[PDB]
PDB file of C-alpha atoms in Angstrom:
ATOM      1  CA  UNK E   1      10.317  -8.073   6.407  1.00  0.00           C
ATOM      2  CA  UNK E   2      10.571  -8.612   2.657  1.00  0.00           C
ATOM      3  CA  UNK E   3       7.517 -10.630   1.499  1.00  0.00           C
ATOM      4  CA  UNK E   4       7.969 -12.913  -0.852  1.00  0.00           C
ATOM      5  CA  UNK E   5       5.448 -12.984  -3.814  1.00  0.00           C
ATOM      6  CA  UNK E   6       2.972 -15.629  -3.586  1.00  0.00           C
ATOM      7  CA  UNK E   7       3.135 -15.298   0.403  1.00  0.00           C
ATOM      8  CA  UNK E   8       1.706 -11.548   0.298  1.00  0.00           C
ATOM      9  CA  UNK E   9      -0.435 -12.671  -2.263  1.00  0.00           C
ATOM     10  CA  UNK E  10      -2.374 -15.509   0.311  1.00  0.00           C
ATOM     11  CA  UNK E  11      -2.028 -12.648   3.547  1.00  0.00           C
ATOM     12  CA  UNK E  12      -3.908 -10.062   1.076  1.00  0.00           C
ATOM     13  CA  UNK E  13      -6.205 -13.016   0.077  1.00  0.00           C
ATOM     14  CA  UNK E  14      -6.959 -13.649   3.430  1.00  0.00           C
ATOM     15  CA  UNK E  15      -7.363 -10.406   4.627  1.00  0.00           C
ATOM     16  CA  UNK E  16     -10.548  -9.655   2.257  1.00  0.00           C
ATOM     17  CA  UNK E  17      -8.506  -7.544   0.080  1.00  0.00           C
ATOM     18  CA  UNK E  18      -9.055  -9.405  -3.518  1.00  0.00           C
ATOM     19  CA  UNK E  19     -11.988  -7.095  -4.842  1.00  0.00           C
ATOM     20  CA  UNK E  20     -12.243  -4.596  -1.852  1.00  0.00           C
ATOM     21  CA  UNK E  21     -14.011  -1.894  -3.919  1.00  0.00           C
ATOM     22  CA  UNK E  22     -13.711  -3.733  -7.279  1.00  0.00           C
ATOM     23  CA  UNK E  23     -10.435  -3.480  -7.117  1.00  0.00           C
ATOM     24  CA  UNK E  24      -8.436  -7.345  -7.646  1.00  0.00           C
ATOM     25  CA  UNK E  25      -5.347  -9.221  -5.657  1.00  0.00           C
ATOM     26  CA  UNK E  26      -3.453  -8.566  -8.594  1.00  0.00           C
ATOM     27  CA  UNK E  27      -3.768  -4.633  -8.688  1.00  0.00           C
ATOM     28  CA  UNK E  28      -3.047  -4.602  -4.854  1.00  0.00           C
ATOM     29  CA  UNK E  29      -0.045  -7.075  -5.752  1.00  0.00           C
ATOM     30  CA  UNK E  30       1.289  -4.737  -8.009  1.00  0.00           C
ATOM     31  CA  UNK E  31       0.843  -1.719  -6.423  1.00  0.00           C
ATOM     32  CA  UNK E  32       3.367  -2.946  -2.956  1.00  0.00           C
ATOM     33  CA  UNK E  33       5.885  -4.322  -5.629  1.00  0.00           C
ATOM     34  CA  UNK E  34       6.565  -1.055  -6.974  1.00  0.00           C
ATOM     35  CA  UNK E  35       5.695   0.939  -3.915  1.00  0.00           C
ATOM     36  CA  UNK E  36       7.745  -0.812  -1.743  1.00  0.00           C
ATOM     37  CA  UNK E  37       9.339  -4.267  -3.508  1.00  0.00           C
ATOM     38  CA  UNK E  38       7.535  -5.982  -0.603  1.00  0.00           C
ATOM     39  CA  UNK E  39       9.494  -4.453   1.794  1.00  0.00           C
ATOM     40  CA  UNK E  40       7.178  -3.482   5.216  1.00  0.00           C
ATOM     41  CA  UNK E  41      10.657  -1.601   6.182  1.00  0.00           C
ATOM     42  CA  UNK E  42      10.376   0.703   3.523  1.00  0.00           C
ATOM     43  CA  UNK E  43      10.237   4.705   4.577  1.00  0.00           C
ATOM     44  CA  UNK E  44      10.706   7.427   1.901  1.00  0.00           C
ATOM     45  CA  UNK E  45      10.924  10.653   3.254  1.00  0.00           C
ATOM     46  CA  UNK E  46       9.783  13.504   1.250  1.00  0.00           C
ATOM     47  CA  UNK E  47      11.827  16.930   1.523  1.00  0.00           C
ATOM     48  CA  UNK E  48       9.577  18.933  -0.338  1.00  0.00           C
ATOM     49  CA  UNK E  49       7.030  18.638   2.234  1.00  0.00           C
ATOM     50  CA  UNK E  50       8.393  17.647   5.021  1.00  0.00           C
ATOM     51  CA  UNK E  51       6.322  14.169   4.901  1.00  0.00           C
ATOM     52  CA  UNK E  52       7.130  10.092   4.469  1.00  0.00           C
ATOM     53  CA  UNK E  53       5.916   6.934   3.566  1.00  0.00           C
ATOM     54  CA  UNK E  54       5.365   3.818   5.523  1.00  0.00           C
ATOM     55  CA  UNK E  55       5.303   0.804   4.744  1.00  0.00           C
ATOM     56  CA  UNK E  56       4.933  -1.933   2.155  1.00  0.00           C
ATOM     57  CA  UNK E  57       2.087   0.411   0.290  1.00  0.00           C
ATOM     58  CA  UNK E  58       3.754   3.432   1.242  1.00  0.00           C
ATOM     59  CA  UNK E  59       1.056   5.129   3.346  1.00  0.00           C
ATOM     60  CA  UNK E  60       1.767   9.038   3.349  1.00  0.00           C
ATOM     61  CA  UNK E  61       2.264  10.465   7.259  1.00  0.00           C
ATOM     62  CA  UNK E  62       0.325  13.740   5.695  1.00  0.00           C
ATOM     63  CA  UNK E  63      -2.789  12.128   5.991  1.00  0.00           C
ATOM     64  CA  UNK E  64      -3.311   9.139   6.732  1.00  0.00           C
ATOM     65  CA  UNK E  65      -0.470   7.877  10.316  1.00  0.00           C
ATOM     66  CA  UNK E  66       0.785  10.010  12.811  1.00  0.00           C
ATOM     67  CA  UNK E  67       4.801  10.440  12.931  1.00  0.00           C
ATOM     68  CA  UNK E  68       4.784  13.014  15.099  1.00  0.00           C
ATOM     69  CA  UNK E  69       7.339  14.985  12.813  1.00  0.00           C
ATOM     70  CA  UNK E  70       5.176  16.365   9.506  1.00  0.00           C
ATOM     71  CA  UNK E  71       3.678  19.504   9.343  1.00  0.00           C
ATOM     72  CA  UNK E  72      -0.642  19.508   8.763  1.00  0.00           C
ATOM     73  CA  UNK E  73      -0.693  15.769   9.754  1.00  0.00           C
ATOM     74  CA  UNK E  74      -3.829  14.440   9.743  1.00  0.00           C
ATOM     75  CA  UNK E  75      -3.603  11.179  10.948  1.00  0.00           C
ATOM     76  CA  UNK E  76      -7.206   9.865   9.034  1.00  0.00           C
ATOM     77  CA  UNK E  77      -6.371   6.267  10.402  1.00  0.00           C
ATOM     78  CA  UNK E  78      -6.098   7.180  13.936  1.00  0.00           C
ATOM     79  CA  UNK E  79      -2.956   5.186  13.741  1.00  0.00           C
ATOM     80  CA  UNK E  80       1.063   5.844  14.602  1.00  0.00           C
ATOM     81  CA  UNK E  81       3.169   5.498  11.330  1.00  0.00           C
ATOM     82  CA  UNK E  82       5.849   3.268  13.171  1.00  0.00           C
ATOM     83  CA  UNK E  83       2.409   0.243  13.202  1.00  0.00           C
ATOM     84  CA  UNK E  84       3.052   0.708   9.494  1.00  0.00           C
ATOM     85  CA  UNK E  85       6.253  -0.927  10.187  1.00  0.00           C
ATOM     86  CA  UNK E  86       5.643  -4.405  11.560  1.00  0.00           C
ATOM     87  CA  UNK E  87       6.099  -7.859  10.181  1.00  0.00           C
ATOM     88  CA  UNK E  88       2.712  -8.521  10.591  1.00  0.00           C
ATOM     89  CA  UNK E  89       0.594  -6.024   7.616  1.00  0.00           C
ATOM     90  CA  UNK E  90      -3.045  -6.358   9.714  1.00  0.00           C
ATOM     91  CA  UNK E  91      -2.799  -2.780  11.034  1.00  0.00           C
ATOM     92  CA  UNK E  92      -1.092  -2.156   7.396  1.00  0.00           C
ATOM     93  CA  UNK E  93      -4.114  -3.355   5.582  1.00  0.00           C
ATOM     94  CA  UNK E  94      -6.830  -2.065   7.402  1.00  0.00           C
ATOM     95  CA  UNK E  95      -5.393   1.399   6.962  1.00  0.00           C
ATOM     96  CA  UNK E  96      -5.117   0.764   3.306  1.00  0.00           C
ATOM     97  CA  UNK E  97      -8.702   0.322   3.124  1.00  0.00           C
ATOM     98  CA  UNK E  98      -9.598   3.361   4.603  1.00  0.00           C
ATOM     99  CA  UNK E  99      -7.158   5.208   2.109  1.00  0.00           C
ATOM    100  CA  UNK E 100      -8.792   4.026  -1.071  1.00  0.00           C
ATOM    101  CA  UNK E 101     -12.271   5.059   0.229  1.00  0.00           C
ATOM    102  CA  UNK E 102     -11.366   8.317  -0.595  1.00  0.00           C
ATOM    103  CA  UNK E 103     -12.507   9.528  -4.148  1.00  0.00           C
ATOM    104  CA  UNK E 104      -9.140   9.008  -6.090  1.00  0.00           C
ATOM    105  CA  UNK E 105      -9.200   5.627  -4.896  1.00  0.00           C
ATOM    106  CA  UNK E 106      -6.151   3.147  -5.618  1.00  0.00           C
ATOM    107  CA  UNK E 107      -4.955   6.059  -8.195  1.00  0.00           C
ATOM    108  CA  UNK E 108      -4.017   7.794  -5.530  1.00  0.00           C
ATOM    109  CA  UNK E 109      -0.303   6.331  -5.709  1.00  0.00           C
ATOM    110  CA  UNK E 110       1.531   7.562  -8.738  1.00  0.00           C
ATOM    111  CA  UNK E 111       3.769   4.642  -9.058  1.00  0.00           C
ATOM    112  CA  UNK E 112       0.310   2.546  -9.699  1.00  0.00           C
ATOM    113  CA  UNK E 113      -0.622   4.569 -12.184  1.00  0.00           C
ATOM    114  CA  UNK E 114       2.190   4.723 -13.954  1.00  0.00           C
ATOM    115  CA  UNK E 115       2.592   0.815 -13.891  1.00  0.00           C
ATOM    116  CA  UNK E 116      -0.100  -0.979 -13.167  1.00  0.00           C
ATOM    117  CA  UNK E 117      -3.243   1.143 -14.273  1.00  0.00           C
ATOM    118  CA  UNK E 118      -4.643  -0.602 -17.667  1.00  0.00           C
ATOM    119  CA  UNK E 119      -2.117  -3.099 -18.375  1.00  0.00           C
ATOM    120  CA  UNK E 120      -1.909  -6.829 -18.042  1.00  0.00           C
ATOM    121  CA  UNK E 121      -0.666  -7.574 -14.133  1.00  0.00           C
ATOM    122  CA  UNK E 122      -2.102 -11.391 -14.046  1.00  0.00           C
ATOM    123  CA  UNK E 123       1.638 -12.097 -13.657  1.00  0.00           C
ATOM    124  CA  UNK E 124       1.700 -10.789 -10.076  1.00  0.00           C
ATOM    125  CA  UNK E 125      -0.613 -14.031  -8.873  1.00  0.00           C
ATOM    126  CA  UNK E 126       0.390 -16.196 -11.361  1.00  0.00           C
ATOM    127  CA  UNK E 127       1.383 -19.581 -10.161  1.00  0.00           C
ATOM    128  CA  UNK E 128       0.185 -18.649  -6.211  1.00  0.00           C
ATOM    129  CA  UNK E 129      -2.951 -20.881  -5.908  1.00  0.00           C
ATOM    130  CA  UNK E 130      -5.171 -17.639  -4.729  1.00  0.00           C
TER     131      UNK E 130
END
């Protein structure tokens, strides 16, 4: 399912993610619209090391889901990749906050840092009551 703005922006809300870890709605909105353009289908597989990416954040099968098809899997969410996958982003989430408790944080994803990190997102909750 493709999310549509505001709509991810009130399941995030209500899912305690606005300031999990200091961190606001708008960051986390930004980060799944150029991770994933809201897409909870979204998969990018990896040749280089044999890994890929779930879901609407993107969540690496490396270390965090198990796909039962990458090498050194770690599976640090105790949860299959294909959950990752579903309409609903509950399992999604709670993975996602296990992720940024590690020390890199939200900077772990490139894409973040490269568009989000220190400039102006307000627009990605703009006009969404949250």
């Amino acid at each position: 399912k493709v999310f549509e703005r505001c709509e991810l922006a009130r399941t995030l809300k209500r899912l305690g993610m606005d300031g999990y870890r200091g961190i606001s709605l708008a960051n986390w909105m930004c980060l799944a619209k150029w991770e994933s353009g809201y897409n909870t289908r979204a998969t990018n597989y990896n040749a280089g090391d044999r890994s890929t990416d779930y879901g609407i954040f993107q969540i690496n099968s490396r270390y965090w889901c198990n796909d039962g098809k990458t090498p050194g899997a770690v599976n640090a969410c105790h949860l299959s990749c294909s959950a990752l996958l579903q309409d609903n982003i509950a399992d999604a989430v709670a993975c996602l906050k296990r992720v940024v408790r590690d020390p890199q944080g939200i900077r772990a994803w490139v894409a973040w840092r490269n568009r989000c990190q220190n400039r102006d997102v307000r627009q990605y909750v703009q006009g969404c009551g949250v």
